[PDB]
Amino acid sequence: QFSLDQFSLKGKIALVTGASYGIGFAIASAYAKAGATIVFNDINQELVDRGMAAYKAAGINAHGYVCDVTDEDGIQAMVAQIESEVGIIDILVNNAGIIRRVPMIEMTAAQFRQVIDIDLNAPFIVSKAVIPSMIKKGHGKIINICSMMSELGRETVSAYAAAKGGLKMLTKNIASEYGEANIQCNGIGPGYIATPQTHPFDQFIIAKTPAARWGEAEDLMGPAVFLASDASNFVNGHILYVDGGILAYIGKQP
Amino acid sequence: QFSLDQFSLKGKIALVTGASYGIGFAIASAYAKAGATIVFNDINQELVDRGMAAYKAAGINAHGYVCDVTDEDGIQAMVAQIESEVGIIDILVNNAGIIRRVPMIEMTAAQFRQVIDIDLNAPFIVSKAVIPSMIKKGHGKIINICSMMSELGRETVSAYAAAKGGLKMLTKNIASEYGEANIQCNGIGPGYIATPQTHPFDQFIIAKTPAARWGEAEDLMGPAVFLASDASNFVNGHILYVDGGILAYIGKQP
Amino acid sequence: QFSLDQFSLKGKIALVTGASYGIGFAIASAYAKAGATIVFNDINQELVDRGMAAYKAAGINAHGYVCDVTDEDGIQAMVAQIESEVGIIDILVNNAGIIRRVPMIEMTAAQFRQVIDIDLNAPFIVSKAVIPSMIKKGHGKIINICSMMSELGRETVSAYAAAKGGLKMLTKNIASEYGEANIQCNGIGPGYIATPQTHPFDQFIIAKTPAARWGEAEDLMGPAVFLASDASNFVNGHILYVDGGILAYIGKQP
Amino acid sequence: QFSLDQFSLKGKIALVTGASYGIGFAIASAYAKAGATIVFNDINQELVDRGMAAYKAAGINAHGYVCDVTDEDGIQAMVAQIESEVGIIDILVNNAGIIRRVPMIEMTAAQFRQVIDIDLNAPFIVSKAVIPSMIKKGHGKIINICSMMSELGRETVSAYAAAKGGLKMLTKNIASEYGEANIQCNGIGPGYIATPQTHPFDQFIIAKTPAARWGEAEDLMGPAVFLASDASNFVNGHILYVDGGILAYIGKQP
Ligand SMILES: NC(=O)c1ccc[n+]([C@@H]2O[C@H](COP(=O)([O-])OP(=O)(O)OC[C@H]3O[C@@H](n4cnc5c(N)ncnc54)[C@H](OP(=O)(O)O)[C@@H]3O)[C@@H](O)[C@H]2O)c1
Ligand SMILES: NC(=O)c1ccc[n+]([C@@H]2O[C@H](COP(=O)([O-])OP(=O)(O)OC[C@H]3O[C@@H](n4cnc5c(N)ncnc54)[C@H](OP(=O)(O)O)[C@@H]3O)[C@@H](O)[C@H]2O)c1
Ligand SMILES: NC(=O)c1ccc[n+]([C@@H]2O[C@H](COP(=O)([O-])OP(=O)(O)OC[C@H]3O[C@@H](n4cnc5c(N)ncnc54)[C@H](OP(=O)(O)O)[C@@H]3O)[C@@H](O)[C@H]2O)c1
Ligand SMILES: NC(=O)c1ccc[n+]([C@@H]2O[C@H](COP(=O)([O-])OP(=O)(O)OC[C@H]3O[C@@H](n4cnc5c(N)ncnc54)[C@H](OP(=O)(O)O)[C@@H]3O)[C@@H](O)[C@H]2O)c1
Ligand SMILES: O=C(O)[C@H](O)[C@@H](O)[C@H](O)[C@H](O)CO
Ligand SMILES: O=C(O)[C@H](O)[C@@H](O)[C@H](O)[C@H](O)CO
Ligand SMILES: O=C(O)[C@H](O)[C@@H](O)[C@H](O)[C@H](O)CO
Ligand SMILES: O=C(O)[C@H](O)[C@@H](O)[C@H](O)[C@H](O)CO
Ligand SMILES: [Ca+2]
Ligand SMILES: [Ca+2]
Ligand SMILES: [Ca+2]
Ligand SMILES: [Ca+2]
């Protein structure tokens, strides 16, 4: 018989990568509010300290680790520490990422490769590191933060789009390969999200979006909790777009 | 600040079409459990009486109406009655449908047209009938029950696939056209669902599905509540597949 | 060993529905230039006479018939006449269609149903009528003229989008069901095509399109010949978009 | 006015990467037959010598170079040599690739990264190297060899699927970013192709495929020539699947 308790993350541990601020912080905050214990990593101590204070201010007793997501040995060690200090990771959110804006033919091979490493290879490293324990626990969730660039291209973001497209298929592959072990791997694909770090451009976004507003990180919270919960146990290899209708809409024409 | 209350349908009224048994009944039951008031229709009194008893047995005080979903005048009148006797419909689930299995070249034009009328035209009639009041209430949800046949074809189900493909685009169109009025129109696309009314075929389904089991109507409840709730307010024109990984998977090969 | 002759339609007969002017005329003209014999239908004698003169002026000896595509008995009789007077139809292009622009809630059920009948049901009627002879000939092609509205919605075009979405799935279904009989059924999905019957709107289209121009009916000719030919024999249930990059592009932002 | 000459590659130079045997060789052979001058690269002299002899036997005067596609400096130098010895590359086919079959959690980070480097990063390197000259010539084509794994996952092929998914989005990005410079970048996505280097598995493939046969490299020739030619000039950011209907079909059930 259905219960709203199917949405609850009580008793579960979630690792959200790069969750010191922004979208990762918002998803982790919502997870905590839904009942979860929060663990997170970032590239330096300063960012970790920032996230730790922000969690504390929100009433959340988070566990923060310095670790590069592209460092497999580092990640494996971090997961080992989390398991001994906190418990088994039930839910992984691959949120850590970078973006570069550079005309493709101007982009150096090193810079292209670096965006691929963090945005595509790293979610494989982290997923790889958490999956064995999820299988033994008898249930896992892996939520990959995708993008509208998992679907559509744009000048200057070639590396990013290639990575997010790859991450979309990595999601479908993990679902296919580990679905039988009761791992659900899905994507959240944010539309246009109004960040601190961001008019004709405003009119442009508003026109493209049926909802007729920018999204906010708060719009991602419900969808992210749904995918981390028992309420989505038969949702697998699926990219949940949270874009107020952008991907469905040809656009507001004159 | 996030709350699990975003998943609650307390204080809301949902119309689920054809919800006397099966998947419609399961979605309506879950909606009631999530807090909603349930209204539903079916083609004859007998089916309505069946649904009414089943709701009562589940502890749900449902409101049932005899109405053909392809009868616009009938539907408009029914919505008028629901508004006077129960209240404004906040949530519509276009669940009523038929399927026929007939080689396409053997299918009569009347039979093709009939599957189209019920499975595609009727959800437009019903959506049309509820949208004006949703706009005035300041929020609406329309959930269209799609299919894997919204994406993939099969021998014998030409009319059904054409209808479900159409319903997929009708969903994206309603999102595009009414998203600005705070209507979210989305799809639920069930995978293989074990019904009462249904081994090498068993092996076939199990192999195709990463989850390695048939779905059940219970698997649709969490996804359907999510789409009817405030937790998905920035999800629009989106087809949520609930298939245990089928659409993501090339298949279990020898 | 590969030959460019794989693109040739020499010795083949093509039926293009509604091919008296516009996109249908351009596809039929190209088919004739590629070697094909052209047959076509339209709703009245006047349109047929128009197409007949235009073909003659282009050096093409076309065969024109008055027939409503929603009239199955009429279509079956027309195919019977074409078979006795011209030969077996090797290639069908479902091009005939209508569009209406009407806010969905303002659209009458009759008008919705009429767009569905012509744009979705009729291509099933016509496909049904040609498939038996294609199977006996040992090869058939059916090209369905889809739209960007097979993928994306817009205000005022609800019925049209629902039909084109349906037509997309009808294409995939015919492929699935008749592919084994050596029928290839595919779609052509035109982007923005500059028609006679059509500035900030100009800037809008140009920005949305990587190619940075309106498409023209001439842009559809190569893709349509490819799909009607031996060069695409292993292409089946596929929607070939011809849009200069629109569907791939998030858009030219400020 | 349409001509079949729109399919001709006369007067054009094509670079097909890794085209010493297999699918690359078949596409290059067809390109030569369509009128093109053939250049190709492979990882060692032995493979190059093999391709060179096979071209000669087919009546084709190919130009072969030893170059690793992941070596940007090497690729840039090779393109410089091709330009001085042969001419400007009008058409690039990113065909070079590797596949590994390894359960994801068993896959080393080095091996994952290597499949990504060759199958995703390398097509960016090669595209980057040819685009400036294409722009100056006033027309370019880039055809990326994708896969059904650009769309669907499977056990053991996580890295490959992630790369091909990425390559799909890289294609759409190049289209978006360089479409205005009259570059058309598209994908060919082969279905199941019977290779030398390859029964219940036979029954499995035959059932999944509406065409009810394995594909062959010859099935890719027409689609590949179409995408390299003037006949597809308004086709951009598009993945042309050549799979006999697999992606359109739910499967042949018992
Ligand atoms: N509009 C949007 O914001 C938007 C839209 C769609 C999708 N997304 C995706 O949403 C996710 C997060 O978005 P956001 O904008 O809030 O944050 P964003 O700038 O990606 O940063 C995410 C976090 O990842 C961390 N990080 C970067 N590289 C790392 C590494 N190698 N190892 C460990 N941590 C690393 C960052 O540290 P630093 O402070 O040093 O960078 C940052 O704290 C990303 O996957 C992004 O691509 C964002
Ligand atoms: N495996 C599955 O069951 C599956 C998988 C994917 C999608 N779906 C979709 O899920 C939805 C419901 O599935 P289901 O299998 O539980 O039920 P299903 O047999 O479609 O029946 C749904 C209800 O619709 C009613 N109905 C039919 N025509 C009507 C009309 N013209 N006016 C009003 N009501 C009408 C039916 O009455 P009757 O008893 O007289 O038919 C029945 O009570 C449908 O849209 C279906 O296409 C089902
Ligand atoms: N921008 C575009 O033009 C565009 C873009 C994407 C897709 N398409 C699609 O391309 C196809 C043709 O486009 P178009 O703009 O050149 O022509 P369009 O106006 O659809 O007209 C096509 C032809 O269909 C005929 N027709 C309509 N209903 C019929 C019926 N019931 N029986 C027989 N014939 C009928 C029309 O006669 P009437 O003169 O009486 O209408 C006309 O000659 C259509 O499927 C359309 O939806 C067009
Ligand atoms: N069933 C299929 O065959 C199938 C289906 C779908 C897609 N595809 C795709 O079609 C393309 C070619 O298929 P295929 O099976 O004929 O060949 P495949 O084994 O990928 O080999 C392609 C060629 O790429 C060369 N290559 C590998 N790494 C290279 C590098 N780093 N630098 C330069 N060249 C390199 C290979 O040399 P080596 O001999 O040393 O490996 C080989 O000659 C690939 O992109 C593949 O992923 C194949
Ligand atoms: O060029 C850009 O800035 C990108 O397109 C962003 O606007 C994306 O929308 C976002 O980073 C998606 O993930
Ligand atoms: O031929 C059939 O019976 C259909 O393919 C069903 O099995 C569908 O899976 C279901 O009705 C989808 O909506
Ligand atoms: O509202 C409109 O006029 C439609 O959106 C057209 O512009 C379409 O682009 C074309 O008819 C597609 O088939
Ligand atoms: O595991 C495998 O062997 C792969 O799935 C192949 O069968 C693919 O079909 C082909 O390599 C696609 O590119
Ligand atoms: Ca985005
Ligand atoms: Ca289904
Ligand atoms: Ca269109
Ligand atoms: Ca493949």
Side-chain angles (χ1 to χ4, degrees), chain A residues 1-196 199-254, chain B residues 1-196 199-254, chain C residues 1-196 199-254, chain D residues 1-196 199-254:
Chain A
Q1 170 173 321
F2 185 73
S3 172
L4 288 164
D5 292 350
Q6 288 184 24
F7 296 109
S8 169
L9 311 181
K10 181 182 185 313
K12 284 159 181 191
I13 294 152
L15 170 59
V16 188
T17 65
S20 68
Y21 61 87
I23 285 164
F25 181 82
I27 289 177
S29 301
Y31 278 18
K33 294 285 105 66
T37 298
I38 302 314
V39 297
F40 84 100
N41 71 300
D42 217 317
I43 35 131
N44 60 52
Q45 198 56 64
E46 289 63 50
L47 285 172
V48 166
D49 294 349
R50 171 187 178 171
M52 283 294 289
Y55 287 117
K56 191 175 158 174
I60 303 167
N61 183 40
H63 304 83
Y65 303 82
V66 173
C67 193
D68 188 327
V69 291
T70 66
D71 177 15
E72 176 170 67
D73 293 348
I75 290 294
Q76 290 270 342
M78 182 193 76
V79 167
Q81 189 179 348
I82 291 155
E83 284 190 19
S84 65
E85 289 177 357
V86 185
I88 308 300
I89 300 161
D90 297 298
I91 299 142
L92 164 67
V93 180
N94 283 302
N95 169 86
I98 66 159
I99 185 164
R100 294 287 178 267
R101 299 174 183 89
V102 190
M104 193 186 81
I105 72 170
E106 290 172 30
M107 198 171 198
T108 72
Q111 287 289 310
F112 190 96
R113 288 179 165 119
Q114 183 197 28
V115 173
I116 306 296
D117 205 37
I118 300 161
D119 292 2
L120 181 49
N121 299 336
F124 141 83
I125 288 162
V126 196
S127 297
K128 173 174 155 185
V130 301
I131 282 160
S133 289
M134 288 174 174
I135 297 176
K136 298 197 264 160
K137 176 73 165 279
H139 196 15
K141 302 293 199 167
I142 300 173
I143 296 91
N144 293 323
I145 309 307
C146 299
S147 174
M148 283 178 323
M149 271 39 74
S150 292
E151 298 298 335
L152 296 167
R154 209 176 72 70
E155 323 78 271
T156 82
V157 294
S158 68
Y160 183 78
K164 290 292 185 197
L167 185 57
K168 174 179 167 192
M169 281 307 310
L170 185 57
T171 305
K172 297 192 177 179
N173 216 85
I174 296 165
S176 298
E177 188 164 20
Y178 298 101
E180 182 171 11
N182 200 35
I183 296 162
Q184 294 86 60
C185 183
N186 293 293
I188 293 270
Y192 287 109
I193 311 304
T195 59
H199 196 106
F201 185 100
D202 188 41
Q203 306 165 255
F204 180 75
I205 290 330
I206 285 162
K208 293 173 73 41
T209 312
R213 65 160 178 98
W214 287 75
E216 66 187 11
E218 289 69 21
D219 296 316
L220 308 180
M221 295 174 162
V225 166
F226 164 70
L227 290 181
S229 75
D230 288 337
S232 61
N233 280 347
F234 212 62
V235 181
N236 214 350
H238 181 81
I239 317 297
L240 180 48
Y241 289 99
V242 191
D243 69 2
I246 292 172
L247 287 180
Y249 187 30
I250 203 160
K252 198 152 214 178
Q253 50 167 254
Chain B
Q1 170 173 321
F2 185 73
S3 172
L4 288 164
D5 292 350
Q6 288 184 24
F7 296 109
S8 169
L9 311 181
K10 181 182 185 313
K12 284 159 181 191
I13 294 152
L15 170 59
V16 188
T17 65
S20 68
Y21 61 87
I23 285 164
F25 181 82
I27 289 177
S29 301
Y31 278 18
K33 294 285 105 66
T37 298
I38 302 314
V39 297
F40 84 100
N41 71 300
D42 217 317
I43 35 131
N44 60 52
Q45 198 56 64
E46 289 63 50
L47 285 172
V48 166
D49 294 349
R50 171 187 178 171
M52 283 294 289
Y55 287 117
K56 191 175 158 174
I60 303 167
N61 183 40
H63 304 83
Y65 303 82
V66 173
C67 193
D68 188 327
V69 291
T70 66
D71 177 15
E72 176 170 67
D73 293 348
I75 290 295
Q76 290 270 342
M78 182 193 76
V79 167
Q81 189 179 348
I82 291 155
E83 284 190 19
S84 65
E85 289 177 357
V86 185
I88 308 300
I89 300 161
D90 297 298
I91 299 142
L92 164 67
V93 180
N94 283 302
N95 169 86
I98 66 159
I99 185 164
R100 294 287 178 267
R101 299 174 183 89
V102 190
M104 193 186 81
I105 72 170
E106 290 172 30
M107 198 171 198
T108 72
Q111 287 289 310
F112 190 96
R113 288 179 165 119
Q114 183 197 28
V115 173
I116 306 296
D117 205 37
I118 300 161
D119 292 2
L120 181 49
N121 299 336
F124 141 83
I125 288 162
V126 196
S127 297
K128 173 174 155 185
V130 301
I131 282 160
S133 289
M134 288 174 174
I135 297 176
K136 298 197 264 160
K137 176 73 165 279
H139 196 15
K141 302 293 199 167
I142 300 173
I143 296 91
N144 293 323
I145 309 307
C146 299
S147 174
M148 283 178 323
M149 271 39 74
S150 292
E151 298 298 335
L152 296 167
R154 209 176 72 70
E155 323 78 271
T156 82
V157 294
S158 68
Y160 183 78
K164 290 292 185 197
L167 185 57
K168 174 179 167 192
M169 281 307 310
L170 185 57
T171 305
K172 297 192 177 179
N173 216 85
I174 296 165
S176 298
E177 188 164 20
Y178 298 101
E180 182 171 11
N182 200 35
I183 296 162
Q184 294 86 60
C185 183
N186 293 293
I188 293 270
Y192 287 109
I193 311 304
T195 59
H199 196 106
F201 185 100
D202 188 41
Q203 306 165 255
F204 180 75
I205 290 330
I206 285 162
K208 293 173 73 41
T209 312
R213 65 160 178 98
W214 287 75
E216 66 187 11
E218 289 69 21
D219 296 316
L220 308 180
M221 295 174 162
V225 166
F226 164 70
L227 290 181
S229 75
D230 288 337
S232 61
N233 280 347
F234 212 62
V235 181
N236 214 350
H238 181 81
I239 317 297
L240 180 48
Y241 289 99
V242 191
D243 69 2
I246 292 172
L247 287 180
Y249 187 30
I250 203 160
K252 198 152 214 178
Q253 50 167 254
Chain C
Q1 170 173 321
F2 185 73
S3 172
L4 288 164
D5 292 350
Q6 288 184 24
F7 296 109
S8 169
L9 311 181
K10 181 182 185 313
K12 284 159 181 191
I13 294 152
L15 170 59
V16 188
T17 65
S20 68
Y21 61 87
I23 285 164
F25 181 82
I27 289 177
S29 301
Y31 278 18
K33 294 285 105 66
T37 298
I38 302 314
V39 297
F40 84 100
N41 71 300
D42 217 317
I43 35 131
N44 60 52
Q45 198 56 64
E46 289 63 50
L47 285 172
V48 166
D49 294 349
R50 171 187 178 171
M52 283 294 289
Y55 287 117
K56 191 175 158 174
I60 303 167
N61 183 40
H63 304 83
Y65 303 82
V66 173
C67 193
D68 188 327
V69 291
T70 66
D71 177 15
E72 176 170 67
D73 293 348
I75 290 294
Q76 290 270 342
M78 182 193 76
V79 167
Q81 189 179 348
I82 291 155
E83 284 190 19
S84 65
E85 289 177 357
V86 185
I88 308 300
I89 300 161
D90 297 298
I91 299 142
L92 164 67
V93 180
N94 283 302
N95 169 86
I98 66 159
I99 185 164
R100 294 287 178 267
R101 299 174 183 89
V102 190
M104 193 186 81
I105 72 170
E106 290 172 30
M107 198 171 198
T108 72
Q111 287 289 310
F112 190 96
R113 288 179 165 119
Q114 183 197 28
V115 173
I116 306 296
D117 205 37
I118 300 161
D119 292 2
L120 181 49
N121 299 336
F124 141 83
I125 288 162
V126 196
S127 297
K128 173 174 155 185
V130 301
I131 282 160
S133 289
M134 288 174 174
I135 297 176
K136 298 197 264 160
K137 176 73 165 279
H139 196 15
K141 302 293 199 167
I142 300 173
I143 296 91
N144 293 323
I145 309 307
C146 299
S147 174
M148 283 178 323
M149 271 39 74
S150 292
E151 298 298 335
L152 296 167
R154 209 176 72 70
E155 323 78 271
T156 82
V157 294
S158 68
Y160 183 78
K164 290 292 185 197
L167 185 57
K168 174 179 167 192
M169 281 307 310
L170 185 57
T171 305
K172 297 192 177 179
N173 216 85
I174 296 165
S176 298
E177 188 164 20
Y178 298 101
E180 182 171 11
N182 200 35
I183 296 162
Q184 294 86 60
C185 183
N186 293 293
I188 293 270
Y192 287 109
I193 311 304
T195 59
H199 196 106
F201 185 100
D202 188 41
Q203 306 165 255
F204 180 75
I205 290 330
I206 285 162
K208 293 173 73 41
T209 312
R213 65 160 178 98
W214 287 75
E216 66 187 11
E218 289 69 21
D219 296 316
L220 308 180
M221 295 174 162
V225 166
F226 164 70
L227 290 181
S229 75
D230 288 337
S232 61
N233 280 347
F234 212 62
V235 181
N236 214 350
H238 181 81
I239 317 297
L240 180 48
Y241 289 99
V242 191
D243 69 2
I246 292 172
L247 287 180
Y249 187 30
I250 203 160
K252 198 152 214 178
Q253 50 167 254
Chain D
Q1 170 173 321
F2 185 73
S3 172
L4 288 164
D5 292 350
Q6 288 184 24
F7 296 109
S8 169
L9 311 181
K10 181 182 185 313
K12 284 159 181 191
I13 294 152
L15 170 59
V16 188
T17 65
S20 68
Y21 61 87
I23 285 164
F25 181 82
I27 289 177
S29 301
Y31 278 18
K33 294 285 105 66
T37 298
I38 302 314
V39 297
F40 84 100
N41 71 300
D42 217 317
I43 35 131
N44 60 52
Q45 198 56 64
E46 289 63 50
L47 285 172
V48 166
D49 294 349
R50 171 187 178 171
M52 283 294 289
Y55 287 117
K56 191 175 158 174
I60 303 167
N61 183 40
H63 304 83
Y65 303 82
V66 173
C67 193
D68 188 327
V69 291
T70 66
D71 177 15
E72 176 170 67
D73 293 348
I75 290 294
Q76 290 270 342
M78 182 193 76
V79 167
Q81 189 179 348
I82 291 155
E83 284 190 19
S84 65
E85 289 177 357
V86 185
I88 308 300
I89 300 161
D90 297 298
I91 299 142
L92 164 67
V93 180
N94 283 302
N95 169 86
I98 66 159
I99 185 164
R100 294 287 178 267
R101 299 174 183 89
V102 190
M104 193 186 81
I105 72 170
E106 290 172 30
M107 198 171 198
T108 72
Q111 287 289 310
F112 190 96
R113 288 179 165 119
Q114 183 197 28
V115 173
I116 306 296
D117 205 37
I118 300 161
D119 292 2
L120 181 49
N121 299 336
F124 141 83
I125 288 162
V126 196
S127 297
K128 173 174 155 185
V130 301
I131 282 160
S133 289
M134 288 174 174
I135 297 176
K136 298 197 264 160
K137 176 73 165 279
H139 196 15
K141 302 293 199 167
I142 300 173
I143 296 91
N144 293 323
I145 309 307
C146 299
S147 174
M148 283 178 323
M149 271 39 74
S150 292
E151 298 298 335
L152 296 167
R154 209 176 72 70
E155 323 78 271
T156 82
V157 294
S158 68
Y160 183 78
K164 290 292 185 197
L167 185 57
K168 174 179 167 192
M169 281 307 310
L170 185 57
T171 305
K172 297 192 177 179
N173 216 85
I174 296 165
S176 298
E177 188 164 20
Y178 298 101
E180 182 171 11
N182 200 35
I183 296 162
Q184 294 86 60
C185 183
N186 293 293
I188 293 270
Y192 287 109
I193 311 304
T195 59
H199 196 106
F201 185 100
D202 188 41
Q203 306 165 255
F204 180 75
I205 290 330
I206 285 162
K208 293 173 73 41
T209 312
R213 65 160 178 98
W214 287 75
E216 66 187 11
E218 289 69 21
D219 296 316
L220 308 180
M221 295 174 162
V225 166
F226 164 70
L227 290 181
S229 75
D230 288 337
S232 61
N233 280 347
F234 212 62
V235 181
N236 214 350
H238 181 81
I239 317 297
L240 180 48
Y241 289 99
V242 191
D243 69 2
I246 292 172
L247 287 180
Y249 187 30
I250 203 160
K252 198 152 214 178
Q253 50 167 254

